[PDB]
Amino acid sequence: VARGWKRKCPLFGKGG
Known part of the structure; x- marks a missing residue:
């Protein structure tokens, strides 16, 4: 989910 969350x-x- 980091792809479209934080970095x-x-x-x-x-x-x-």
Whole structure:
């Protein structure tokens, strides 16, 4: 979800 959430790998609090 990091793709369209935060950056690329890292998303919320999980990993990526």
